[PDB]
Amino acid sequence: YSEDEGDSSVSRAAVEVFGKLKDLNCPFLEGLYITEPKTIQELLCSPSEYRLEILEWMCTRVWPSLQDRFSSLKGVPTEVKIQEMTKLGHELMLCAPDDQELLKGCACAQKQLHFMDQLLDTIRSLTIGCSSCSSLMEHFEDTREKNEALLGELFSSPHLQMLLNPECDPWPLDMQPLLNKQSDDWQWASASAKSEEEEKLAELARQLQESAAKLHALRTEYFAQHEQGAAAGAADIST
């Protein structure tokens, strides 16, 4: 029951979203330099026509057969493109066949932003693949060769028993009996401890605040009757 950090985190995530969109220099970058984080959040997370335009132009860029079915078979409702994009997301192993509430725009901000984040990551990967390779055939062959080289080098070492079994032993030999003294007294405390930890955090920070205030007040009250002896304190105690 604490949603204060989530909206700010979504706003910051939208800030690097807008920066990443500005990096690629889209042809429709003119006229809309929206930079306030919450405005970017309600632009690219609430249902708006501009985000749909960006995604449909991107999907035209990455795969031409959808635009072939567009122009050759014009007269298509918008929800048909919505369900088609949901499907093409689905065999990206990303969403369900009926997750058209994503493409409608009404979906919650965080997972839409995350979804388009791996989407732009795949865009970046295909772009750097096609940068050094002239054709799709050459890029495909080079990707095959580099992937078989990678899978060859992963499984050529006897050190993977640490990878498959991540150990938890950086401790010395004199500390384990401290664990074994109360080794069976923890399995219940990890149930609903998040709200408990945050409420001790809040009230203990509060206690820190008022303790600092009271010690400062007491020190100032002590110094109120001390400044007449502050100048007189130069005399040594033993003398």
């Binding site: 990878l163 498959l164 079994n165 991540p166 938890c168 401290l178 923890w186 990890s190």
Partner: protein, 51 residues
């Protein structure tokens, strides 16, 4: 191959984080107890001193 690797590393990370969280919170609890009795030792020392 990549999907199988991802799933098995996900399971390994899950058991790793369960063990790590349990152990780390146990040593944090004994950290709290050690500093509690340590603070008792400081207050006893300073008390007897200024007596």
């Amino acid at each position: 191959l990549l999907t199988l690797l991802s799933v098995k590393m996900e399971n390994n990370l899950a058991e790793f984080e369960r063990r790590a969280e349990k152990n780390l919170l146990i040593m944090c609890k004994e950290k709290e107890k050690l500093q509690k009795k340590a603070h008792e030792l400081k207050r006893r020392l300073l008390l007897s001193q200024r007596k």
